[PDB]
Design a protein around this ligand. Sequence first.
Ligand code: HEA
Ligand SMILES: CCCCC/C=C/C/C=C\C/C=C/C/C=C\CCCC(=O)O[C@H](COC(=O)CCCCCCCCCCCCCCCCC)COP(=O)(O)OCCN
Ligand SMILES: CCCCC/C=C/C/C=C\C/C=C\C/C=C\CCCC(=O)O[C@H](COC(=O)CCCCCCCCCCCCCCCCC)COP(=O)(O)OCCN
Ligand SMILES: CCCCCC/C=C\CCCCCCCCCC(=O)O[C@H](COC(=O)CCCCCCCCCCCCCCC)COP(=O)(O)OC[C@@H](O)CO
Ligand SMILES: CCCCCCCCCCO[C@@H]1OC(CO)[C@@H](O[C@H]2O[C@H](CO)[C@@H](O)[C@H](O)[C@@H]2O)[C@@H](O)[C@H]1O
Ligand SMILES: [C-]#N
Ligand code: CUA
Ligand SMILES: [Cu+2]
Ligand SMILES: [Mg+2]
Ligand code: NA
Ligand SMILES: [Zn+2]
Lengths: 49, 98, 58, 227, 514, 105, 144, 43, 46, 73, 84, 79, 259
Amino acid sequence: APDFHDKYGNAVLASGATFCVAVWVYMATQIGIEWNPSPVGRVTPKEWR
Amino acid sequence: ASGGGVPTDEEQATGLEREVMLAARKGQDPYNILAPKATSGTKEDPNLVPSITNKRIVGCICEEDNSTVIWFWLHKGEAQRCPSCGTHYKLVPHQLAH
Amino acid sequence: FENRVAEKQKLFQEDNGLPVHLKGGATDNILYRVTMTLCLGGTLYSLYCLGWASFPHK
Amino acid sequence: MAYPMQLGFQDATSPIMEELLHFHDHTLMIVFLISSLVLYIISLMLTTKLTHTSTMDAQEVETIWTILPAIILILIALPSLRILYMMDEINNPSLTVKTMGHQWYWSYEYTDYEDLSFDSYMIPTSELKPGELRLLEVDNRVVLPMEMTIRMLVSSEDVLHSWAVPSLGLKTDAIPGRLNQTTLMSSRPGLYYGQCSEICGSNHSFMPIVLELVPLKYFEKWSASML
Amino acid sequence: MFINRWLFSTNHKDIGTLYLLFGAWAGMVGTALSLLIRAELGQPGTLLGDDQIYNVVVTAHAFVMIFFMVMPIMIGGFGNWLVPLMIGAPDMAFPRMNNMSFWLLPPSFLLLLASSMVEAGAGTGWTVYPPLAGNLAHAGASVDLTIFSLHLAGVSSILGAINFITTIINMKPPAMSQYQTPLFVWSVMITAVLLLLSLPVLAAGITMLLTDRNLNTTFFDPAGGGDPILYQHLFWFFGHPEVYILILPGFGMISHIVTYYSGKKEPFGYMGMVWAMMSIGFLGFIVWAHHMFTVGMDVDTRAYFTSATMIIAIPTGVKVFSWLATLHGGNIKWSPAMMWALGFIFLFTVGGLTGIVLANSSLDIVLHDTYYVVAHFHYVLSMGAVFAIMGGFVHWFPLFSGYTLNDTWAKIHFAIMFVGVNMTFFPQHFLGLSGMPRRYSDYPDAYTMWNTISSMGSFISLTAVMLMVFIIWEAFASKREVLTVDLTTTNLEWLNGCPPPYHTFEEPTYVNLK
Amino acid sequence: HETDEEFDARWVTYFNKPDIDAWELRKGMNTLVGYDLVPEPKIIDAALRACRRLNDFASAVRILEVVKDKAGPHKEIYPYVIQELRPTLNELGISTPEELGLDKV
Amino acid sequence: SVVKSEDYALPSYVDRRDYPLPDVAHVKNLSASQKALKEKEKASWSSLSIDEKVELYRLKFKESFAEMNRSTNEWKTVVGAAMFFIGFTALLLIWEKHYVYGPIPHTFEEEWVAKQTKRMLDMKVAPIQGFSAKWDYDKNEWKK
Amino acid sequence: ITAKPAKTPTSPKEQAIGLSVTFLSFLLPAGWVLYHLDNYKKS
Amino acid sequence: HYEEGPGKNIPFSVENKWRLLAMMTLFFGSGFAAPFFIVRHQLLKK
Amino acid sequence: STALAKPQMRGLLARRLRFHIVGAFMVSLGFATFYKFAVAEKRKKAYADFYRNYDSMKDFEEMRKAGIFQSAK
Amino acid sequence: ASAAKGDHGGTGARTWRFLTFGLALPSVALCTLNSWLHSGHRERPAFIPYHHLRIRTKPFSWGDGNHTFFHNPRVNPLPTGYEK
Amino acid sequence: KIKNYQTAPFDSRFPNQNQTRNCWQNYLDFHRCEKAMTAKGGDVSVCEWYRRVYKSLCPISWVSTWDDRRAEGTFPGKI
Amino acid sequence: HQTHAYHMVNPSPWPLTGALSALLMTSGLTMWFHFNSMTLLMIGLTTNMLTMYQWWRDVIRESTFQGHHTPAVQKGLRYGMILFIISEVLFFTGFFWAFYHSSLAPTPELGGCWPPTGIHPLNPLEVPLLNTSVLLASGVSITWAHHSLMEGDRKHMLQALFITITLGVYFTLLQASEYYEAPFTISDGVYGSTFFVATGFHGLHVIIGSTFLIVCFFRQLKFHFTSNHHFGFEAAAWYWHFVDVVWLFLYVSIYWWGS
Ligand code: HEA
Ligand SMILES: CCCCC/C=C/C/C=C\C/C=C/C/C=C\CCCC(=O)O[C@H](COC(=O)CCCCCCCCCCCCCCCCC)COP(=O)(O)OCCN
Ligand SMILES: CCCCC/C=C/C/C=C\C/C=C\C/C=C\CCCC(=O)O[C@H](COC(=O)CCCCCCCCCCCCCCCCC)COP(=O)(O)OCCN
Ligand SMILES: CCCCCC/C=C\CCCCCCCCCC(=O)O[C@H](COC(=O)CCCCCCCCCCCCCCC)COP(=O)(O)OC[C@@H](O)CO
Ligand SMILES: CCCCCCCCCCO[C@@H]1OC(CO)[C@@H](O[C@H]2O[C@H](CO)[C@@H](O)[C@H](O)[C@@H]2O)[C@@H](O)[C@H]1O
Ligand SMILES: [C-]#N
Ligand code: CUA
Ligand SMILES: [Cu+2]
Ligand SMILES: [Mg+2]
Ligand code: NA
Ligand SMILES: [Zn+2]
């Protein structure tokens, strides 16, 4: 006789993963968080003096 | 240099203190102060376990110096055996108060 | 003095179901209520003091 | 200074800092070993249906796993202690500078010859000049001669503080009534940053240290001009 | 009835239950405080705009987690419920004094909350070092209220320690020697001997602080010939034993949980585990000044404290390998308590190994007072204690309540917590090696990346805590009542049923001498 | 301790005791599966005959299941042991868990 | 069949790989036919049918080894649900970013960063390995 | 461990209510303080 | 002498799951909310 | 129809243990080798190469010209 | 050491009383004489406002806040010197 | 005059991290010397080495406080 | 009904009144120190006294009157007392540590010397020597008390115990006069600090010890002690020897060596 896991297992796994990745991607890239990554290879140094 | 006036335990001990002191004088141990000595523990000569009810927890230290104690309810009726060493225990119920 | 221990023993072993702290009779009950009233009263007063001291008295 | 995403120590500015980096590398190798060996032995214990649940004899395997650790700790302690005592060794400074902690800024005294002293306060963020470092810059830097042994003496005139410059391997607490000594030698010129390293109240986060290391002749003229 | 049972208790189980409720509640406070910390640091700049308030939050976070969550749960909570049961005793030796150890804690917590409400709080660090904690830099009542809070919590644990020692030495079956009591009872006894010896030294040092603040003494004030460093020795002389006090009952529970879910009747190397806890207890009194390596310490004193500190890893590793050896050959049961205990073994190892980096006074000069130390102790201490407590709590919840948890929900909770705590504290090693001080409300911009990740991890653990609450609700809401429990023959505390009656071992166990 | 041969011989004798009771049968099997080994066919053969003397068919089948379990992922052990026991199984009328459908989940 | 709480102090039945022969039979009360089966079992087992052997097994024991040791799909629910609550955490973090945090300092603006970065190279921050070591001071670019 | 079936089963829907209510009891009061932090700071 | 058994050895009632929910909510909720309110209090003092 | 040979039946768990502790050890020695190579030796050489012909007055003059000092223009 | 006496058959009440009256109380009477002899007030020293003495970082919670709890006017100067 | 001072040298009587007593001993010596000289009819310039050492080591605020206290009559060391 | 010898205590209000009294006394000292009011303190001191009075009254009820102190109960009490005195010894230890730290390395503020400039110590041969003979004498008279009680001798028990308490009280009055007479105060730097706070906690213990002996005196008067069962008297004698030994260390350290 199928339990909770047999019946819902696959769907809990799939949408849990889908949901978790989507929302953490959104939070990370879309809402103005400044991660402050290394300038190395990405920033062109500019005259400051 | 001296004189008296100080009561003794025989005169003045009361309640459970008096009870233990009186039983000890008769060589008895109704309050479990002493560790019981083991019999040979066979079917024919089981450890006899007093109880005032129909079951009592036994702890068996199977070999001298084991740090592990084996614990089980001993029930009134036929001798039971320790599930680790097989030594035999039998419950002997009832009383303590007259 | 005479030894009246046996009397006290008879009184504190009387089978009346009373807890030891109340087993001496009516005076125990009084002393108990005084103690507990001062403790609970003093504690509410300390909470009051905390409320008052929690704010600037500029 | 630290840079974005840094994982390990700032690059060393002094020979003693360099020593510490190599000693950390030795230690952390061991640390890695042990932790991996462990994570691993564990997954080994946990990935078999085979059982053996009866009493196991211990006094034997206990030998290994007490002696091997003791050995490893000795392989850490030997170089640890050599560094400790090497840094304690006499060196003959050419200069002594005092620094006094306060709430919340550092004062510096250079009184081998003249009475030179001044206060060193963080640059407020709204007053930073373009390209300067939030929380790290000061109005008056601790100018010092490069390639020379300096004695720093550290104290406080109020609560505890602590005078730190990570790139030089330095951290000495600043305690009132006491005068703590440390020595400093920079192999390079440049600007070297630290931050107060004992909680001293509201602005603990905002009384930084900035060392300015230059050739002796520039330090001497800077000194004269600060009188 | 209610008041007699719950305010006037002389029963070890009910007083153990009160400690667990009290510690769960403290835990929600210390958790809110830690999330305020991580919110301040979660982006560059200022959140609260008030760094005295930040320092008060940091201070309260540590005192609440240590004195009101961990010690009550481990020793008052699990030590009261389990130690008398595990030795077949009818109660604690002093069952009425035991109830005053409990009731001293709500007043001690109230004093702590009072110190944060009056004036500007005590923003001192949980180390409360003068002069910052003296009557000039922290004028007014907040630091005195803190000191009094510590006095009450000190009295409560010292009378607790007298109660446990006496109970464990004097109330076992006549035939059971000390080398026949379970390892958890050993871990409580050793913890208690350390409480007994160390807390009176803290009490003497915080009393000196109180008189320096209010009676014109000058123990720590150089203007009268005093010395701030003396307070630090008095404090750490207690403070080091304190850290072993917080973890030793956790190691006791761990040993019982690993043994139990390995299907084993006994831990591997019992006398080695005893020997290890005794050696750690003994050596825990001679290493304290590794908390003071930047104070201006002579070199030979530094070399000695580095070496004595290392020697402690030796007995500590016996215990790690003996837990692995207990798992070896086990019929491994993957219950939520087993996962907590395995996560414990891994986190504790990580944190003990960064401890070893720190033992080296030459490297500690650069790591001291940086996030590398915060990372060390949130692994070995903080997560170690929390994981043991969650392990113990899931394992023995059915014993205390007579109900079962939902094992799936409890696996889910472990999983979220394990991700959260690692996302929170692992990045702090990087912050500390790169030089970020501890006790800071804000940081130079280079440290942004790891601070941000660390603050995000902290919310993941929040979600796990809210879930824990709902999980405990669900068990009491569904009332699945326990029927059977395995391995009772080597877990005596389970043998009177779930929950056991108010009075157990009214007739003592029978144990033959032979 | 002792040789493999002496260990096995002691276990044989244990279960060959004519008047072995049901308690001893269980104690011996439950102790034996604690060791790091799958019991030799001659030990299992003695245990099975003890099941016969105690008129306990179900325990004989359970004994076969636990041999298979004690081998863990060594899938060659159980078929070899059953091969070795087949005359005793035949003689005593003991069906294997597989013949009973009791290997299905 | 039916187990009772007030039986806690009595030997009980368990299914465990490591305790194959539990202390009592799973079924202790017998019907008239179950009693005739137990009688039959005193005779040669070769005369028992397959159905009767099964019935004897199921009287002594609840679940077979294969039944008690079966693996389950529980892990999917555990890992999926944990990722769900972790995902739910991101929503708290999006909220906190939107309503609690204000603008971070002006020193993170793109032009500030470019100028700071040049200054760090000018002062040769971490010139041995960490930072400036990665800049080519000859070609005036980041080392490839 | 074995246990009886729940005496008072808590269905998926009732779980959803106990879980939401539990999360709101932690989220709303702290959310409300943090949302109004500006109002505190300049007041 | 006292009630014994599941749900009876505790200072709170578990007779009704919803009343229990409310109580648990208040109990853990008050603990969690207290530091936010103390910080609000200290900000508002000045 | 051939008989199956007798397989090993004894000490299976201990055999598995013996086997993998030796592998655990080898992972560690082949890793020790790696860490000593990608991190530790790499460091000694970075420092050694940097300082071999390092000219500190030249380094200062470039910083001075970049305008970074308070004390030296 | 073994002191310089004897008894030791048993250490009973009679022996301890013998010690209380024969040794302990006579010591106390000797010390009380040697004290109520060297007593009589000694000449109080010139006042010097040393900064390590007469500490005041917070007023005492009694009196006018500047007197110690067992202030003796004769021999305890205030921070400003001996009292009138 | 046998001088040429850059800074205070290593003093084996005060080899460890706490240099307070180094500062204080030199401050004492200088003022003891200056007293022995300016009394017995001689030159304070023989006192110069201790003056240089305490100046190099001692916080300005300590020297300043100790100088006030010598003027006030409240300096607790023996000069 | 139990068949072990241990004592199950009736549910009691004293733990809670003791806890609240600690909150009132601490709140109280705070109020006194910072808000110039003695009211809370006076209330927590009163409830504390009442708690100790009733809680120990009850122990006397449970033992002399009700017989719950079996040998096993009495043995636990002996452990609890010994552990208690250990915790008090560690407490004094932190004050000895403070004393030695400050006196072994006197800072320049003091003059760089011990005793500091401007401190004139008591002569250790005057009243401190007298105090020493007083406390040592009271350790001989209490041991006479103890042997008399064991020998069944009521009158000599009461006499020796009386002498012992009179000596405690003489020590306490001598000390109160020494405190008044001393030319230095608690505010006189770390010399005053360590002197007064160490000898002052010691004086409090002498007062507690003396109170405990007076309790035993009244119980003896009431015939509570048997020649074999008198734990209250033993505990008070152990605590009394503790107070004497702490004094000997104070005398040797602070008064003699620190002079
Ligand atoms: C659970 C509590 C706990 C425990 C167990 C420890 C354990 C250790 N700690 Fe730590 N420690 C803290 C709580 C704890 N600590 C706290 C709270 C602080 C700082 C508080 C503050 O400032 O606020 C701290 C701070 C602290 C410092 C000061 C850092 C500083 O402030 O500069 C130091 C340095 O010596 C240190 C070292 C160690 C070591 C060597 C251990 C050891 O006992 C660990 C040994 C264990 C292992 C090593 C893992 C197990 C072993 C093996 C797998 C075997 C083989 C291992 C080897 C051969 C190495 N700790
Ligand atoms: C400002 C001052 C304040 C002082 C502070 C007070 C504290 C002290 C406390 C109280 C002491 C009181 C004493 C009690 C006195 C009488 C008790 C009555 C009992 C009694 O009479 O005891 C007798 C001895 O007493 C006796 O001389 C009592 C003798 C007392 C001895 C001390 C006096 C000193 C004697 C001078 C000689 C000194 C020379 C010594 C050299 C050698 C020493 C090593 C023995 O007789 P008994 O036949 O065995 O009795 C049987 C039944 N009772
Ligand atoms: C007569 C000899 C016996 C001593 C007892 C005397 C009675 C006074 C009050 C009780 C003191 C007992 C405890 C010890 C505490 C501190 C100081 C005590 C010693 C003392 O009495 O010192 C006096 C100062 O008292 C002051 O400030 C007194 C300030 C009084 C308030 C005391 C503050 C109490 C705070 C204590 C908190 C204690 C926490 C301990 C917790 C235990 C661990 C949990 C000395 O007088 P002075 O005028 O400075 O010098 C004499 C010059 N003519
Ligand atoms: C103005 C004065 C105020 C001062 C405040 C505190 C002062 C007062 C405390 C003085 C101590 C009084 C203690 C009296 C205890 C009486 C109860 C008692 O003594 O109880 C005995 C048990 O011991 C027991 O619990 C022994 C229990 C031991 C308690 C001793 C505790 C010392 C208390 C210290 C408290 C402060 C700590 C230090 C502060 C820095 C009863 O057994 P027995 O004697 O064998 O009798 C039975 C026989 O009759 C049968 O035949
Ligand atoms: C550190 C752990 C904290 C975790 C993060 C908590 C995240 C979820 C919190 C939700 O809380 C609320 O959300 C609001 C808005 O989203 C608030 O309403 C405010 O916002 C409104 C609309 O913006 C108005 O309708 C209102 O009057 C109101 O005060 C506020 O009351 C609060 O309870
Ligand atoms: C370690 N502490
Ligand atoms: Cu100054 Cu922190
Ligand atoms: Cu420590
Ligand atoms: Mg520090
Ligand atoms: Na911030
Ligand atoms: Zn046995």
